[PDB]
Amino acid sequence: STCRVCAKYASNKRSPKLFERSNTKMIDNIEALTGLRLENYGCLPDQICECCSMELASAVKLRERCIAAQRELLLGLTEEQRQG
Amino acid sequence: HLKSTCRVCAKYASNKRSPKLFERSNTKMIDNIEALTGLRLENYGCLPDQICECCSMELASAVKLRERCIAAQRELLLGLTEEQRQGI
Ligand SMILES: [Zn+2]
Ligand SMILES: [Zn+2]
């Protein structure tokens, strides 16, 4: 019934389970975004809501696009322009 | 192309609707980009110096989620009784 990521209502049905040894992707993406390793505790929620899943997928895509774009722009340059 | 390129996605950017990253009004965006990616982007004459509209929107949305997630972990910990909390 509660989302571990935004602490609001979920569904306990259409809310994916964060810790299900296969969406370790989600926990990885959360740590990459926030610098927090979320741990499975009995007294905390174990679910992510659909809205949080979607925004997380979007933020990861932008992060990867941004890193790859800095390498692509670097290659577009002449060897001289390459500095710092 | 430099004038019409997004520094964040390397694709076309509308000059007039692309905020200039390295100006005082936008220093928060360089920090948001570093929080998201781990990269501190730098102002060089030979690299684009604007963020396109599409990148600005997705970046704003990524920041909101980042902050909500950090604050949600605090709020769940306070939502516990002291005996529950002794766990973390
Ligand atoms: Zn949520
Ligand atoms: Zn862009």
What part of B 11-30 touches A (C-beta under 8 Å)? none
Q: Are A83 and A43 in contact (CB under 8 A)?
A: no
Cα(A71)–Cα(A31) distance, rounded to whole angstroms? 23
Of A29, A14, A13, A21, nearest in space to A5 by CA = A29
Backbone angles phi, psi at A47, to 5 degrees: -125, 155
- For chain B, what is the radius of gyration of the CA atoms? 18
For residue A55, report the distance from its CA to the centre of ligand 1, in Å.
9
Residues of B in contact with A30 (CB under 8 A): 69
* B78 close contact with A: CB closer than 8 A: no
Q: Does domain B2-87 have CATH number 3.10.450.50?
A: no
Cα(A59)–Cα(B37) distance, rounded to whole angstroms? 10
The string of DSSP codes covering B15-72 is GGGS-BTTSGGGHHHHHHHHHHHS------TTS--B--HHHHHHHHHHHHHHHHHHHH
Cα(A73)–Cα(B81) distance, rounded to whole angstroms? 52
Count of other CB atoms within 10 angstroms of residue A44: 19
Residues of B in contact with A6 (CB under 8 A): 65, 68-69, 72
Tokens representing B27 are 């220093």
Burial class (CB in 10 A: 0-12, 13-18, 19+), B40: exposed
What resolution in angstroms does the PDB record give? 1.9
Q: Are A3 and A45 in contact (CB under 8 A)?
A: yes
Backbone angles phi, psi at A2, to 5 degrees: -115, 140
Cα(B2)–Cα(A7) distance, rounded to whole angstroms? 43
Mutate to test the interface with A, among B7, B42, B65 (most CBs of A within 10 A): B65
Question: Do A65 and B8 make contact, defined as CB atoms within 8 angstroms?
Answer: yes
Backbone angles phi, psi at B77, to 5 degrees: -70, -40
The DSSP output letter for A9 is: B
Residues of B in contact with A26 (CB under 8 A): none
Cα(A5)–Cα(B34) distance, rounded to whole angstroms? 21
Cα(A20)–Cα(A30) distance, rounded to whole angstroms? 15
Q: Nearest C-alpha of chain B: how many angstroms from A35? A: 9
Tokens representing A37 are 């390793």
